[PDB]
Amino acid sequence: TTVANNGMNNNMSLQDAEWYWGDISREEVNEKLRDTADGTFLVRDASTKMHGDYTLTLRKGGNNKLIKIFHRDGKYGFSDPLTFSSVVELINHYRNESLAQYNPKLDVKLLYPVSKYQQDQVVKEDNIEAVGKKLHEYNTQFQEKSREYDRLYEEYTRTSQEIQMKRTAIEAFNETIKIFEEQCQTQERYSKEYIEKFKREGNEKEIQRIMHNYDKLKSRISEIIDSRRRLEEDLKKQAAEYREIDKRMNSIKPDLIQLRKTRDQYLMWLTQKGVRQKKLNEWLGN
Amino acid sequence: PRILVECLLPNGMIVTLECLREATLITIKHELFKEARKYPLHQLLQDESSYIFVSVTQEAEREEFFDETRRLCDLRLFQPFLKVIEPVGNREEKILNREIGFAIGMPVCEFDMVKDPEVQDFRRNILNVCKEAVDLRDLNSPHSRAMYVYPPNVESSPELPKHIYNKLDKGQIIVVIWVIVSPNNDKQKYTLKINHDCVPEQVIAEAIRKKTRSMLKLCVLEYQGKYILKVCGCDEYFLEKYPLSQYKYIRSCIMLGRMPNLMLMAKESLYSQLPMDCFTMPSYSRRISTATPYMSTKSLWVINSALRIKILCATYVNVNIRDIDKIYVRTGIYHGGEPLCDNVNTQRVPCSNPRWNEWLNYDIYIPDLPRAARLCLSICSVKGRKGAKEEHCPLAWGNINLFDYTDTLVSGKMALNLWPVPHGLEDLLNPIGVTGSNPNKETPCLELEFDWFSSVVKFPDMSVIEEHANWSVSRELRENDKEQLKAISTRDPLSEITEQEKDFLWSHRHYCVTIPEILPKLLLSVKWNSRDEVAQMYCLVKDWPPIKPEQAMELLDCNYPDPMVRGFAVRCLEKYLTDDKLSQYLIQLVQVLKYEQYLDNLLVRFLLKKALTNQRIGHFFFWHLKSEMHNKTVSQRFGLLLESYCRACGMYLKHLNRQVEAMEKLINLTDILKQEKKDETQKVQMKFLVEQMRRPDFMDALQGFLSPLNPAHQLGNLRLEECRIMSSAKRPLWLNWENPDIMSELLFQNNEIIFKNGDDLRQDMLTLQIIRIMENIWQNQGLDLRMLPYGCLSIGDCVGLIEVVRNSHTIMQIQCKGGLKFNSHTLHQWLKDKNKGEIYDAAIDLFTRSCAGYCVATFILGIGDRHNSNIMVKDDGQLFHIDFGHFLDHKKRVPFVLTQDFLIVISKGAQECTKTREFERFQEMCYKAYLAIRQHANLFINLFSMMLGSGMPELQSFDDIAYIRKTLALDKTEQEALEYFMKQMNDAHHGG
Numbered sequence A: 001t002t003v004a005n006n007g008m009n010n011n012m013s014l015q016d017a018e019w020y021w022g023d024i025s026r027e028e029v030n031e032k033l034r035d036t037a038d039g040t041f042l043v044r045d046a047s048t049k050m051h052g053d054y055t056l057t058l059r060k061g062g063n064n065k066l067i068k069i070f071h072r073d074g075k076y077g078f079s080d081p082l083t084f085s086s087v088v089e090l091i092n093h094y095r096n097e098s099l100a101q102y103n104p105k106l107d108v109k110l111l112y113p114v115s116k117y118q119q120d121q122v123v124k125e126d127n128i129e130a131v132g133k134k135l136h137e138y139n140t141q142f143q144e145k146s147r148e149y150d151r152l153y154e155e156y157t158r159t160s161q162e163i164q165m166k167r168t169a170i171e172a173f174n175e176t177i178k179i180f181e182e183q184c185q186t187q188e189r190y191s192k193e194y195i196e197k198f199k200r201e202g203n204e205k206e207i208q209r210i211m212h213n214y215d216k217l218k219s220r221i222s223e224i225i226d227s228r229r230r231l232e233e234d235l236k237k238q239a240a241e242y243r244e245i246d247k248r249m250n251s252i253k254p255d256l257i258q259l260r261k262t263r264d265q266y267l268m269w270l271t272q273k274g275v276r277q278k279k280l281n282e283w284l285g286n
Numbered sequence B: 001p002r003i004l005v006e007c008l009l010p011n012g013m014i015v016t017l018e019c020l021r022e023a024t025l026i027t028i029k030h031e032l033f034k035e036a037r038k039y040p041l042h043q044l045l046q047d048e049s050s051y052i053f054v055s056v057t058q059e060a061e062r063e064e065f066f067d068e069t070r071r072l073c074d075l076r077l078f079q080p081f082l083k084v085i086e087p088v089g090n091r092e093e094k095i096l097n098r099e100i101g102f103a104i105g106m107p108v109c110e111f112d113m114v115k116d117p118e119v120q121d122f123r124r125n126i127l128n129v130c131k132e133a134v135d136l137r138d139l140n141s142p143h144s145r146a147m148y149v150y151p152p153n154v155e156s157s158p159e160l161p162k163h164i165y166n167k168l169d170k171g172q173i174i175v176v177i178w179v180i181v182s183p184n185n186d187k188q189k190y191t192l193k194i195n196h197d198c199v200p201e202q203v204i205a206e207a208i209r210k211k212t213r214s215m216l217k218l219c220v221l222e223y224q225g226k227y228i229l230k231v232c233g234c235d236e237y238f239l240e241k242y243p244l245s246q247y248k249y250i251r252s253c254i255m256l257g258r259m260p261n262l263m264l265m266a267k268e269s270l271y272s273q274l275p276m277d278c279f280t281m282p283s284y285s286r287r288i289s290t291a292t293p294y295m296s297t298k299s300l301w302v303i304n305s306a307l308r309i310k311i312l313c314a315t316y317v318n319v320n321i322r323d324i325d326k327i328y329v330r331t332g333i334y335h336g337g338e339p340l341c342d343n344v345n346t347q348r349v350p351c352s353n354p355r356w357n358e359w360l361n362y363d364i365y366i367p368d369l370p371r372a373a374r375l376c377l378s379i380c381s382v383k384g385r386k387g388a389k390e391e392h393c394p395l396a397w398g399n400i401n402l403f404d405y406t407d408t409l410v411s412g413k414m415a416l417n418l419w420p421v422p423h424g425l426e427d428l429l430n431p432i433g434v435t436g437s438n439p440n441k442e443t444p445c446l447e448l449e450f451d452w453f454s455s456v457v458k459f460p461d462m463s464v465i466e467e468h469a470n471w472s473v474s475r476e477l478r479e480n481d482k483e484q485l486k487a488i489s490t491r492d493p494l495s496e497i498t499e500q501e502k503d504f505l506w507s508h509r510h511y512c513v514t515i516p517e518i519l520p521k522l523l524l525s526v527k528w529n530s531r532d533e534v535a536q537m538y539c540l541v542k543d544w545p546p547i548k549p550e551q552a553m554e555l556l557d558c559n560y561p562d563p564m565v566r567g568f569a570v571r572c573l574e575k576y577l578t579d580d581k582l583s584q585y586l587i588q589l590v591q592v593l594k595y596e597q598y599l600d601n602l603l604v605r606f607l608l609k610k611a612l613t614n615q616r617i618g619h620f621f622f623w624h625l626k627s628e629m630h631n632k633t634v635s636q637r638f639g640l641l642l643e644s645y646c647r648a649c650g651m652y653l654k655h656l657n658r659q660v661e662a663m664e665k666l667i668n669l670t671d672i673l674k675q676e677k678k679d680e681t682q683k684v685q686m687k688f689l690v691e692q693m694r695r696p697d698f699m700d701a702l703q704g705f706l707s708p709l710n711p712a713h714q715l716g717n718l719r720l721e722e723c724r725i726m727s728s729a730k731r732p733l734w735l736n737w738e739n740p741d742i743m744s745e746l747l748f749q750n751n752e753i754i755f756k757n758g759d760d761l762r763q764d765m766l767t768l769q770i771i772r773i774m775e776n777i778w779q780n781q782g783l784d785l786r787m788l789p790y791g792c793l794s795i796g797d798c799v800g801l802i803e804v805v806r807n808s809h810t811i812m813q814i815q816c817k818g819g820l821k822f823n824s825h826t827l828h829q830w831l832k833d834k835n836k837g838e839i840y841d842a843a844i845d846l847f848t849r850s851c852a853g854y855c856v857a858t859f860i861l862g863i864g865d866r867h868n869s870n871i872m873v874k875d876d877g878q879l880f881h882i883d884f885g886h887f888l889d890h891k892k893r894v895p896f897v898l899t900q901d902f903l904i905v906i907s908k909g910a911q912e913c914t915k916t917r918e919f920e921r922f923q924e925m926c927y928k929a930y931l932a933i934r935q936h937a938n939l940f941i942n943l944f945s946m947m948l949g950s951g952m953p954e955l956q957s958f959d960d961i962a963y964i965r966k967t968l969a970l971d972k973t974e975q976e977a978l979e980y981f982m983k984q985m986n987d988a989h990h991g992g
């Protein structure tokens, strides 16, 4: 949540405020406004980097609605005329009143600042050596864990290909059994009126030989049911392996994305604090 | 060679026969029937005419093997079993269908057995396009079939570039005609003289009147209809009545300064060379879709209610109960990537019992749904234990069209399978994924229940929208807004558009008919979750003037899913886009085919019609969609398109299948080269491949097949001595094939091909495509920064082909050559040694210009660390980058640092490379190249935005394209971008 309570000085400093963020690109402002609700807003330095354009990215209807305020004769406002002086009292006036004054379509007035120092609350150890060691161990843990997640995704793809080709092989066995059963039914239809006549004329050696090589058909279907069984047990345990590998990447993905979020916020902290890559690049360049 | 194959005779008795590996069906069937007659119960047996073999392939489908000529190894049988049964079907349809299935890798009867009615309606309606294409193919047979089988390679420019118009002797091209006219195939030279303005009719007339020298009206006319121009060594034929400056062979000869190599082959010989193609209607076309559901109803604009969707349960979420506590099915009503309303979430049920039964209501009302509404189910779960802060992570995603092919709202309880999460997906839903259930069954499935009206509700025809357009209006400019509109028009597609400007755009629409460029911004300035706005915009689009194709393709990527908008864009494409730049942009249109919510629409009709009327376009279309059978998200749609193309492409099928099976067999080689061979210094390090290609069954499968990188190039006898492997990236294949035709010595006696496995050659194709459009821009604006986009083609999952340009060497190559036979002057000295003399400085000029081609390129595209091995220079002084791969950001600056050796070579070997006279000329042409790219960067944003749903692990959404947006500096002005590049090219030497 937002505590606000900046103070009694309404026309306060532009550079340090809950609304302000400075010269930030679209990627990280899209990261900030994601998973937000109505009335969530943010004001940054504009994409043109001109003198005081200072666009706004209020959230409404699931879209980062990109309001731009003007810089006419040193004043600010959503659109002409610019009857309001300062941006802080502008956003406070839209915190007090609706947006129906300038345009009718907008309904939400304002609900939630995205403060620059809300994330700064959870961070500590302002001294350089502590955050240096913390960033080093965060980076090596992130590298090892990203290698583990890449291995997990490779295993997931390999098991998906294995289970897909085994599923196709099982379907091929199913089609083979269907063809063999249809052939068996057809030959029963032909042979229900064939064997007993050659019995009636009195000879059985040909019948026992054709019965022997007919039993070869039932023998063959007997081992191919065995092969389909050994491939279907294989399919079931490989599906279980696929499920547990998906469970492992289920466990590995979310702490990975929040660790990446913390790494990004630490990069932002180093950027705003002013120290660039001086000694951290020496370890990674080895 | 000794396979014991068992056969199911239709009398019933069981026979087993030995079979050879190379034996065909006729070779084995004769002794099969012989020893079947020898074996007892020879009563129902008769001749082989009415008996047909049936077996199940390794792709798990029974299919009759009517074609008796096929070998045993071509059968691809999972088990050595055959069956003997009556035909009970058609001959030609079944050989055609099996060949189609071999060209896809999966048979047509898979399409037969799938019960999705949209698939079969697509299969019915594609034959309309096929029959129209083959009717226009033979409307002027065999003349039109000549342009089909061998396509002209012309551009859309009747004129010529100005800086190459001065490269000739006052607009005149010296060619050589290598016509034989000899029973003893004697070759000879006719060096001959043409301008550039005339069509090949005057060229063949001049060749007739100059051929008749040294042995001297109607004769010229009858030889005109009996002779034709052919490029030597490669199968391009000059056919159509075109001004001959557009043929790419002639323009490439102007580029490189080489004289063109042509001949006069007989027209009737070419006509007899191409076989007559046949097109037969399918068996499923017998069924007519005239349904009479004895049970027209009301439309969307009479039913007033809210969108209520009830979630019942998931089948089984694939989670772990130990570390994950609760799950939820946060949904979203998307229009591409734009949420049409708020993301309504479900309850936070535990993962033990994934049952919801929640009637999620949505802010959108029923009449205000757009045509391309896309529900986005997503199983994502809170897997973080924090105070008043929930950590969210996607697990399963799945998109659903709210309207079907019938163009009606979905209703009734229905289950649907969910796709797994993509690699590194930032968003919790998936805006860009296609609509449809997962074909695999062992993935989590979830149940939905729409607002069951106990009826069907139909989105109306455009008459209702047209009347509502006149209704809603009832419910001369200040030029500042006009120049504001002009300013909006020049903005890139990823421009930061504001609702001040969006409301300005929507409030002034009938005044936007003056400029056509403003349309895609007007796409983003309308609320798709509206009733009047969509009707107004449809009324505008119906009366909207046509668009240049470069930004008419803007309406095609994932942000513009509207069927009417995409239909207008496709209409503008077929009205304006030409064949050469269709084949240029073919990869992008192939990837746009994913973004279609349906199967049958106008884009697929247009791309099929252009593919079935052009061998080059159709061939590259087939290979581009064949490369993505491993992508199961669009495997069905693209497989249907391979089925349609292979139905209506003609005899190229055979050639196609040959190269396909060649590639497939070659792919198989890399499997043994990768899975079995993963070590070093054994007895079979190189001898194994020599012995394996010494096998006749493998080498005969690589004979006489056309090159997959170019249908004009044809591949013949393999040279096992000149085939080897490398150890550069992941051990690819060096393949050498002699060009079969006799006149091959003019261009190249041998074709070299890299066959690469281990890396995805799909982003490399995109990079080389970018290189080719920057070539086009620089040639059009008057700067010959000759940089070569060598041909590359992905042919499946992590498999690709690269055509080799010869007389090239790495920096590592020349460095080790100098060391054996290191210093920072070896490249310039080597270029002295290759081509000295009066041409040398010109080569240096080329080496400057190609440098000015690549460095700027490698900054704009953001290619990775260009070291000394992933770059090669030619003998004529031209460099090029090969291992592109990681492009744009790909690791989250300073790409392709200008090395010292460049500073020697461009500066003529001077010791003080910093302020030589040619260096500021280099910088000036770099500036001009960047500016010429910069007013054409909207096309580049379009072309990269039409690649988001492709599936590279380094281009997903609007998180990567900001890299080219910030290197191209669309936010900045021209001068700020200039000083940006003086900054980077001043720190290129870290001070210079």
Ligand SMILES: Cc1nc(NC(=O)N2CCC[C@H]2C(N)=O)sc1-c1ccnc(C(C)(C)C(F)(F)F)c1
Pocket: B726, B728, B729, B730, B732, B754, B756, B790, B802, B803, B804, B805, B806, B807, B808, B809, B810, B813, B882, B883
């Ligand atoms: C366009 C191109 N041209 C070549 N030509 C020679 O290698 N030649 C030609 C002369 C002899 C030989 C040489 N000196 O060495 S290789 C090549 C290419 C393009 C893209 N990827 C590759 C891979 C995958 C093999 C690499 F290198 F990255 F690992 C190669």
